[PDB]
Amino acid sequence: KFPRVKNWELGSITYDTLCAQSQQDGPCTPRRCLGSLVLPRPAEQLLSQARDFINQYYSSIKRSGSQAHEERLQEVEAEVASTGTYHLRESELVFGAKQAWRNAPRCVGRIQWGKLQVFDARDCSSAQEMFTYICNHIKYATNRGNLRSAITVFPQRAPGRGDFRIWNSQLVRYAGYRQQDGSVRGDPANVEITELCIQHGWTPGNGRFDVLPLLLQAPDEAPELFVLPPELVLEVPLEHPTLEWFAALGLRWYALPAVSNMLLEIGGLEFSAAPFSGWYMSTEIGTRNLCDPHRYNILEDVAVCMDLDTRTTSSLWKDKAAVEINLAVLHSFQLAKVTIVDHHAATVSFMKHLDNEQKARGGCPADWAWIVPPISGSLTPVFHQEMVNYILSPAFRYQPDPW
Amino acid sequence: GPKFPRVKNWELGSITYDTLCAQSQQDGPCTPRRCLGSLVLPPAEQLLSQARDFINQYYSSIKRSGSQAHEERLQEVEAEVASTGTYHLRESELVFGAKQAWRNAPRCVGRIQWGKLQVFDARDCSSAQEMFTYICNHIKYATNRGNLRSAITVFPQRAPGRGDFRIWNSQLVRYAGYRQQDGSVRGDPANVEITELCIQHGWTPGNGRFDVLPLLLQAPDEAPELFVLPPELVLEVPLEHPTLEWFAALGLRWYALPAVSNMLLEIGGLEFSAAPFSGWYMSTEIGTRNLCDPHRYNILEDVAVCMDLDTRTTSSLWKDKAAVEINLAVLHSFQLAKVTIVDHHAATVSFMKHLDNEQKARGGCPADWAWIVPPISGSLTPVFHQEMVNYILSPAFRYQPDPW
Ligand code: HEM
Ligand code: HEM
Ligand SMILES: Fc1cccc([C@@H]2C[C@H]2CNCCc2ccnc(-n3ccnc3)n2)c1
Ligand SMILES: Fc1cccc([C@@H]2C[C@H]2CNCCc2ccnc(-n3ccnc3)n2)c1
Ligand SMILES: C[C@H](O)[C@H](O)[C@H]1CNc2nc(N)[nH]c(=O)c2N1
Ligand SMILES: C[C@H](O)[C@H](O)[C@H]1CNc2nc(N)[nH]c(=O)c2N1
Numbered sequence: 169k170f171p172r173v174k175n176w177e178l179g180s181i182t183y184d185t186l187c188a189q190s191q192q193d194g195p196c197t198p199r200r201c202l203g204s205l206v207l208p209r210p211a212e213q214l215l216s217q218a219r220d221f222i223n224q225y226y227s228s229i230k231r232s233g234s235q236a237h238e239e240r241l242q243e244v245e246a247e248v249a250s251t252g253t254y255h256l257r258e259s260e261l262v263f264g265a266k267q268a269w270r271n272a273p274r275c276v277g278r279i280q281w282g283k284l285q286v287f288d289a290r291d292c293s294s295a296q297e298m299f300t301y302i303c304n305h306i307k308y309a310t311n312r313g314n315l316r317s318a319i320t321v322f323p324q325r326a327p328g329r330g331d332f333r334i335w336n337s338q339l340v341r342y343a344g345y346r347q348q349d350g351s352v353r354g355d356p357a358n359v360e361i362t363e364l365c366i367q368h369g370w371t372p373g374n375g376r377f378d379v380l381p382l383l384l385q386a387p388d389e390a391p392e393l394f395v396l397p398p399e400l401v402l403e404v405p406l407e408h409p410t411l412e413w414f415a416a417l418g419l420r421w422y423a424l425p426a427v428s429n430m431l432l433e434i435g436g437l438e439f440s441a442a443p444f445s446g447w448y449m450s451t452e453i454g455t456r457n458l459c460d461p462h463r464y465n466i467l468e469d470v471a472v473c474m475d476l477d478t479r480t481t482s483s484l485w486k487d488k489a490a491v492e493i494n495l496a497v498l499h500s501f502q503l504a505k506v507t508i509v510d511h512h513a514a515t516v517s518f519m520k521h522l523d524n525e526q527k528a529r530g531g532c533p534a535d536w537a538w539i540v541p542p543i544s545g546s547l548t549p550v551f552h553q554e555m556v557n558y559i560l561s562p563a564f565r566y567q568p569d570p571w
Numbered sequence: 572g573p574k575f576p577r578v579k580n581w582e583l584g585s586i587t588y589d590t591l592c593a594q595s596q597q598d599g600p601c602t603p604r605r606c607l608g609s610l611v612l613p614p615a616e617q618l619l620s621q622a623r624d625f626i627n628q629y630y631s632s633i634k635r636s637g638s639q640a641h642e643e644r645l646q647e648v649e650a651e652v653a654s655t656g657t658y659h660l661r662e663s664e665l666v667f668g669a670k671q672a673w674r675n676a677p678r679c680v681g682r683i684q685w686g687k688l689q690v691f692d693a694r695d696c697s698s699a700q701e702m703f704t705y706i707c708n709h710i711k712y713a714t715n716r717g718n719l720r721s722a723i724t725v726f727p728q729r730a731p732g733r734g735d736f737r738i739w740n741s742q743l744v745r746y747a748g749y750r751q752q753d754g755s756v757r758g759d760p761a762n763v764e765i766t767e768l769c770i771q772h773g774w775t776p777g778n779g780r781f782d783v784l785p786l787l788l789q790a791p792d793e794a795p796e797l798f799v800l801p802p803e804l805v806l807e808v809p810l811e812h813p814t815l816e817w818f819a820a821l822g823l824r825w826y827a828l829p830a831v832s833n834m835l836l837e838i839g840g841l842e843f844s845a846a847p848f849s850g851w852y853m854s855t856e857i858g859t860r861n862l863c864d865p866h867r868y869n870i871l872e873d874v875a876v877c878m879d880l881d882t883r884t885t886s887s888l889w890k891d892k893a894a895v896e897i898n899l900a901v902l903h904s905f906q907l908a909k910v911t912i913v914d915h916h917a918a919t920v921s922f923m924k925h926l927d928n929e930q931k932a933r934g935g936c937p938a939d940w941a942w943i944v945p946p947i948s949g950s951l952t953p954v955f956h957q958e959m960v961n962y963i964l965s966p967a968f969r970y971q972p973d974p975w
């Protein structure tokens with residue numbers, strides 16, 4: 169019933185009892201484990217999800233069974249009975265957003281979970297207003313390089329009405345231009361979104377690091393294009409502490425990691441546009457974004473500037489170049505006074521979070537394959553830590569692309 | 572469309588479906604409620620159905636399903652179980668089964684080599700002394716003066732009303748771990764218990780960082796007997812670095828032959844409690860895990876100090892830098908010494924070729940992503956980007972409790 173979780177570096181053992189509170193099935197069965205997969209393959213339901221969330225909320229403020237708790241359940245029930253849905257109070261919304269971050273099994277930054285600035289954008293009626301809200305989010309979150317975690321929450325989904333959506337997967341993303349020679353200029357992950365922007369009237373550049381406009385969509389309307397004021401998008405030129413030629417590569421990356429295509433679920437309510445941001449863990453940039461074969465793919469270039477032997481895998485040229493690239497990102501961000509956390513510091517804080525959560529809730533949902541960094545896996549403490557994965561609500565969730 | 576797990580490669584955008592998992596007869600640890608896949612360790616009628624299933628697998632592999640010889644073997648196996656409670660594998664059945672168990676092992680990245688496995692039948696073994704002889708032969712053959720060859724030696728199966736053949740050591744070759752008076756450990760902390768067991772059984776212990784352990788071998792219903800491997804049979808490689816000249820002065824070394832000796836080999840319901848197998852190392856096994864794990868030799872800080880790195884801050888990436896050079900040293904030294912080894916790049920590439928082979932041959936391949944992805948430079952290898960389905964097929968290798 170209760171999974172036994174072991175750390176193999178320390179020999180310590182916990183028991184996850186929190187998993188029992190999961191109301192949603194993952195993709196695994198006793199026959200086969202599908203844990204390495206990236207994506208998933210009435211009014212009484214909503215009401216039960218609502219009562220549960222409201223119960224969580226009043227529990228969190230040490231007010232269970234109190235009159236305001238009882239009265240709040242009646243409101244929710246009254247509203248659902250009459251309208252098929254209900255609405256959250258701002259304080260409840262704030263609670264729900266923090267819990268969803270807390271419950272996100274793939275996020276290594278969760279030690280920070282209680283410190284989230286929540287912007288209520290539920291009074292938004294147009295793409296233009298979404299743009300204003302997003303611009304303020306970016307300004308606030310970026311804070312001249314001293315990054316602060318934030319989420320802005322747009323109006324919830326409603327029956328038989330189009331969703332508010334941000335079409336971009338992040339608020340800040342570099343264009344990928346499919347050249348005719350089959351190659352890709354810029355970021356290949358973004359070829360499609362780049363093409364949608366062009367179709368909807370965007371004048372493209374021809375750089376490797378052209379910041380994309382946002383396609384914002386108000387319900388049942390064509391999306392609208394919005395260029396971000398370049399002074400809002402903080403960026404960090406990449407150079408290397410000891411290799412002078414590195415800066416010549418023309419490499420750079422943006423400060424603000426803001427996810428804008430995930431769905432936020434709270435108490436049965438769904439928020440289809442609720443962009444959030446924290447700060448980068450350096451491997452996301454140095455390893456995945458810059459070195460993935462299907463991304464900027466710079467490994468061989470850097471390796472050659474380092475005069476390494478590309479001819480054979482056994483010279484570990486890839487491993488060597490990857491380390492210098494990650495060191496460059498960390499150095500550069502530190503020099504530009506922009507918040508960043510290395511994979512060692514991050515995983516150490518995550519272990520502390522696991523311990524905090526073990527005492528607070530009896531467990532912590534974690535996706536080992538995502539928590540372990542893409543380089544130097546076993547060099548970090550989380551590699552040696554068993555982990556249980558499961559879905560708790562409030563939750564962040566993937567959703568289909570609006571097109 | 573298809574009612575089977577959809578598996579995606581995110582580097583190449585290609586998709587497959589695993590139909591093979593439908594053949595899984597054993598539940599793993601996961602449920603729809605929670606995934607437990609990161610966990611390291613999470614009656615005649617029964618035997619007969621396992622036996623019938625294996626015999627069917629065997630006759631399929633030789634393309635004789637439905638044949639007279641197929642149906643006679645089924646009747647032959649059921650008769651044996653009916654009168655003895657158990658049965659016995661033909662020689663070629665054992666060879667097939669051993670290979671299929673390796674082919675089926677979700678955690679082994681070396682499975683491209685699965686068809687090339689030398690199977691030594693030792694089911695006639697009747698003493699601990701004889702077990703030692705068979706093991707020495709295995710080591711000699713498998714080591715082959717550095718030109719390593721995959722092999723397994725199969726000792727007699729569990730018999731009802733009789734004690735097991737057991738090799739107490741977790742590997743045929745492992746280094747002693749001596750608990751110190753200050754609480755530290757000299758040698759390999761992984762092997763402290765087995766080391767103390769060897770001493771309790773009369774071994775005269777050394778006091779180096781790399782003393783080869785003797786073997787504790789247990790014949791049925793007898794106390795384990797102790798055997799020292801003649802040093803010339805145990806091939807070792809002193810570790811040096813191709814450019815850092817001081818690395819050789821660290822006096823680090825590792826053994827050539829990676830031989831797992833404590834796992835249970837299950838075929839058709841028959842259980843072989845002693846069936847040691849060996850391949851060749853993937854270099855990260857030694858350079859990253861054995862040498863840099865905090866609870867193993869833990870040499871990262873020592874090497875980083877020699878490299879004059881800033882060990883006072885995480886953001887200098889001193890651990891990453893040191894780990895790279897250690898792995899390079901491992902590869903460089905094995906190659907210099909002409910001892911077979913494979914780096915994590917070549918290994919993972921070959922495993923991808925294996926996935927493609929198995930997709931065509933069986934409609935999938937059970938694989939443990941957390942074990943297949945190497946402990947350094949994960950996303951720089953192609954397997955990181957490959958979704959993987961994990962499930963238990965049989966024949967299988969399984970963990971089994973330590974015999975003490
Ligand atoms: C404060 C510093 C933060 C750090 C260092 C951090 C770190 C990370 C990292 C490295 C990932 C893996 C992403 C990937 O590799 O694609 C991740 C995932 C995730 N994080 Fe964070 N995060 C932070 C803040 C936040 C905040 C404020 C939220 C929400 C309010 C959040 C929610 C999530 C979610 C839902 C995922 C999974 C994304 C997906 O499945 O694509 N994180 N985090
Ligand atoms: C020929 C070259 C081989 C290579 C490069 C190789 C590689 C590996 C590696 C890297 C692991 C992970 C073990 C760990 O990290 O602790 C592993 C596990 C495993 N291998 Fe191999 N292997 C090879 C040959 C063999 C052979 C001949 C067999 C059996 C017939 C085998 C069966 C297994 C099994 C059962 C495991 C799981 C071990 C466990 O769970 O503790 N491998 N292999
Ligand atoms: F096609 C796809 C289907 C599912 C997921 C995919 C890639 C994994 C999703 C990216 N995951 C989040 C990436 C990201 C980017 C920027 N910031 C964060 N971030 C910020 C705070 N915490 C995480 N995360 C592609
Ligand atoms: F206490 C424990 C409980 C379960 C597993 C554990 C460690 C993971 C098992 C070691 N796994 C095998 C390591 C190994 C060593 C030498 N050779 C191989 N090998 C040889 C061919 N293929 C793999 N494997 C401890
Ligand atoms: C197939 C595999 O699950 C996929 O490559 C995962 C692995 N772990 C990851 N971990 C993080 N942090 N981010 C990712 O995108 C992925 N991708
Ligand atoms: C907790 C985690 O499951 C454990 O440390 C695993 C991770 N992946 C591994 N992968 C391999 N190849 N070998 C291992 O011993 C482990 N250990």
Ligand SMILES: [Zn+2]
Binds near residue numbers: 200601607
């Ligand atoms: Zn699972």
